[PDB]
């Protein structure tokens, strides 16, 4: 130990400044710590988990507190369409007098920030109405954040620490997470909806003071246990219903109308209560599949052992795969992140098309913000999923214990996997760029008729199957003589068909040749990023250039200049490479989303449809066009309320380019520079009275790529965010 970082003796004996740097970036890599055991590993993680939950609870508690104390909300509830939600108050002594004037918006008393996360629509939909509601909610989360720390501390104590085999009790945890964590939680959420949320949308306020001697339904729980549940869908809210009031209010608490509430343009509250109630069943019954202490259930191991196709085309199938996953926390994290990354994108693609919060669709900046938010989160999560996959292969993978099972066969034919991913990327790349450039030349030579505009009829055919009238086609749900139509006839379909064919909402938007090209760009982005990541994973343990890439670990600088040169040959380094491509991919996705939507909100889908087929159009009619109000945030003539976004816009450019230094220039140059400065300090009078305690050295080879990538990423995210918010909110 002796000094920081004392989870690693060998790194504390570093006489340079590298000990501090590396002491921070390895603080959570518990397995690399000194005297680590499997016992301390699971205990440290378990404790960190409570710490994380504590921060989450505390974080949301802050938002609630500040919205209540510095935000209107109550003013917003009366006029959702015509009140800007307030994030919080601005207190900055650097503010000049103009900035204080320009920023005091939303009917506040001083300069404030306008929220674009959409918590206002969420809490209004949820049932929250006044500030008092928000405070008690903030108190409750502050409380939950305390008992998180309290529980984290408790299981670090010797008489409450759980054994490793307790953590490896998979079937018990799954039986409880499915049944309790997913099911009961969802069940009880539908409870909040029919008690507070739904009656709140009908003018009656149901809080803790009066939720006992007040019925959610006239027949009141009678029909549920009777079996005639249909009574709860007997009288839904009217089509002329107004949210928060009794005008048009029904009595139903569980429906399946489909489509949107006309006023709020959001999903019916009675559709969502029903949704979670139905969900909770498949989850409650689902969490009784695996075996515990009652003599019934499944052995997850025994299932995997039993799934070997005869004729051995998958070898030994999934045998031994139970222990391979249950012993390796990285395999579990990889599976967790991949799954979580997919439903993170699923959330993004569903919340813009099928809004669940009242009056959230009208707020275009919030809708743009939230979509871009999750698609980058999902993107980052996806690369991490493909990072611990490699880590698993290096640290936990046991070749003999996975002999000839599906996992081993992956490595066995890794060249085939990688080469085809390379072919798919090359195919998509050559033609998507090819078609874009061809069209740009046609526009250049002033002959747009010569363009190659391929109609996306496959996807148009899908939309027709959903019931979209455009394109014709006479597909299912688009045809009067369709068994699928007459089956759902007058259930969810009238609401659905009405919504899918409304021209305002983002429910299955019309797509054309311009949509065709960007999607292949997207396809290109996905295939390449995966190609990089899985080539990294499958080569983590070695290659022809470096047969023993294991023994060296996940992250190492290289293997020297011999054998041709081996820079960026570690599995950590292709992660590093893949992040760039994932940033490029999500960038294409959010460019696509935001341009399609601003033209829609502007009533000018023509501009997108005619300019998205050639790349000059993207530069001129999307980026150059919408940058107008942004870059005029401050001017030689004045400053606006968009000045902060203009400043951040450059800030992003600065951080981004600053990262280019760490990525382009490498270490040997800076090491030789610093040692000349080491000379200077010692030979300068009055200055050599002061001596450094840590020897100044250049950042390491890997550290450089990390620092560079962080800048590149921070710049990336901060630049687009400055543009996304300003161009949108400047126009709305």
């Amino acid at each position: 130990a002796l000094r920081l970082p004392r989870f690693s003796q060998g790194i504390a004996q570093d006489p340079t400044t590298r000990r501090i740097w590396f002491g921070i970036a390895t603080a959570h890599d518990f397995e690399s710590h000194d005297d680590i055991t499997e016992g301390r590993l699971y205990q440290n993680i378990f404790a960190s988990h409570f710490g994380q939950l504590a921060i989450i609870f505390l974080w949301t508690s802050g938002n609630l507190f500040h919205v209540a104390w510095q935000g209107n909300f109550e003013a917003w509830v009366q006029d959702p369409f015509h009140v800007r939600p307030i994030a919080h108050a601005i207190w900055d002594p650097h503010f000049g007098q103009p900035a204080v004037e320009a920023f005091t918006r939303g009917g506040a008393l001083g300069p404030v920030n306008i929220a674009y996360s959409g918590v206002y629509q969420w809490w209004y939909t949820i049932g929250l109405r006044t500030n008092e509601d928000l405070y008690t909610g903030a108190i409750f989360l502050l409380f939950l954040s305390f008992i998180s720390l309290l529980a984290g501390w408790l299981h670090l104590q010797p008489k409450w620490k759980p054994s490793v085999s307790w953590f490896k009790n998979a079937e018990s945890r799954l039986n409880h997470h499915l049944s309790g964590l997913f099911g009961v939680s969802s069940l009880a959420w539908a409870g909040h909806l029919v008690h507070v949320a739904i009656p709140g949308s009908r003018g009656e306020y149901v809080r803790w003071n009066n939720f006992l001697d007040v019925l959610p339904y006239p027949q009141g729980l009678g029909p549920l246990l009777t079996g005639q549940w249909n009574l709860y869908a007997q009288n839904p809210s009217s089509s002329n219903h107004l949210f928060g009031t009794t005008q048009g209010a029904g009595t139903a608490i569980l429906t399946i109308l489909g489509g949107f509430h006309p006023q709020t343009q959001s999903l019916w509250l009675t559709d969502m209560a029903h949704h979670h109630l139905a969900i909770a069943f498949l989850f409650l019954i689902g969490g009784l599949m695996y075996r515990t202490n009652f003599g019934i259930g499944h052995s997850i191991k025994y299932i995997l052992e039993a799934h070997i196709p005869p004729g051995g085309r998958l070898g030994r199938g999934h045998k031994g795969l139970y222990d391979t996953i249950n012993n390796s926390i990285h395999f579990q994290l990889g599976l967790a992140l991949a799954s979580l990354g997919v439903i993170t994108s699923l959330v993004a693609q569903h919340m813009y098309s099928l809004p669940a919060y009242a009056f959230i669709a009208q707020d275009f900046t919030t809708q743009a913000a939230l979509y871009t938010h999750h698609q980058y989160i999902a993107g980052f999560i996806m690369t991490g999923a493909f990072a611990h996959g490699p880590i698993f292969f290096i640290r936990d993978y046991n070749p003999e214990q996975n002999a000839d099972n599906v996992l081993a066969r992956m490595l066995e034919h890794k060249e085939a996997i990688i080469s085809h991913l390379s072919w798919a990327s090359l195919f998509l790349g050559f033609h998507t760029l090819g078609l874009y450039v061809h069209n740009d030349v046609m526009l250049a030579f002033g002959t747009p008729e010569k363009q190659i505009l391929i109609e996306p009829i496959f996807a148009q055919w899908i939309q027709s199957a959903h019931g979209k009238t455009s394109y014709g086609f006479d597909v299912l749900l688009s045809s009067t003589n369709g068994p699928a139509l007459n089956a759902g006839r007058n259930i969810w379909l009238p609401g659905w068909l009405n919504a899918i064919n409304e021209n305002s909402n983002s429910l299955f938007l019309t797509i054309g040749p311009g949509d065709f090209l960007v999607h292949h760009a997207i396809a290109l982005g996905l295939h390449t990023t995966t190609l990089i990541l899985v080539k990294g994973a499958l080569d983590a343990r070695g290659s022809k250039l470096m047969p023993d890439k294991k023994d060296f670990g996940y992250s190492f600088p290289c293997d020297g200049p011999g054998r041709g040169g081996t820079c960026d040959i570690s599995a950590w380094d292709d992660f590093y490479l893949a992040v760039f491509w994932m940033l490029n991919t999500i960038g294409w996705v959010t460019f696509y989303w935001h341009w399609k939507h601003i033209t829609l909100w502007r009533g000018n889908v023509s501009q997108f449809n005619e300019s998205s087929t050639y790349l000059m159009g993207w530069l001129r009619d999307y980026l150059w066009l919408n940058s107008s109000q942004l870059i005029n945030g401050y001017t030689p003539l004045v400053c606006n309320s968009l000045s902060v976004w203009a400043w951040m816009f450059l800030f992003g450019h600065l951080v981004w380019a600053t990262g280019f230094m760490f990525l382009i220039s490498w270490r040997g140059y800076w090491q030789e520079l610093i040692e000349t400065l080491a000379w200077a300090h010692e030979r300068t009078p009055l200055a050599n009275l002061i001596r450094w305690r840590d020897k100044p050295v250049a950042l390491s080879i890997v550290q450089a790529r990390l620092v560079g990538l962080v800048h590149f990423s921070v710049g990336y995210i901060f630049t687009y965010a400055a543009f996304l918010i300003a161009s949108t909110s400047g126009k709305f």
């Binding site: 002796l2 000094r3 920081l4 501090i20 108050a89 207190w91």
Partner: peptide, 29 residues
């Protein structure tokens, strides 16, 4: 005016934090 928690977070906490970290980091048990 509670908005005078800003400097505390804004400056005082950071200074204390930095000084402390600096000391812990240079410590030689």
């Amino acid at each position: 005016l509670p908005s005078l928690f800003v400097p505390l977070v804004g400056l005082l906490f950071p200074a204390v934090a930095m000084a402390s970290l600096f000391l812990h980091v240079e410590k030689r048990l």
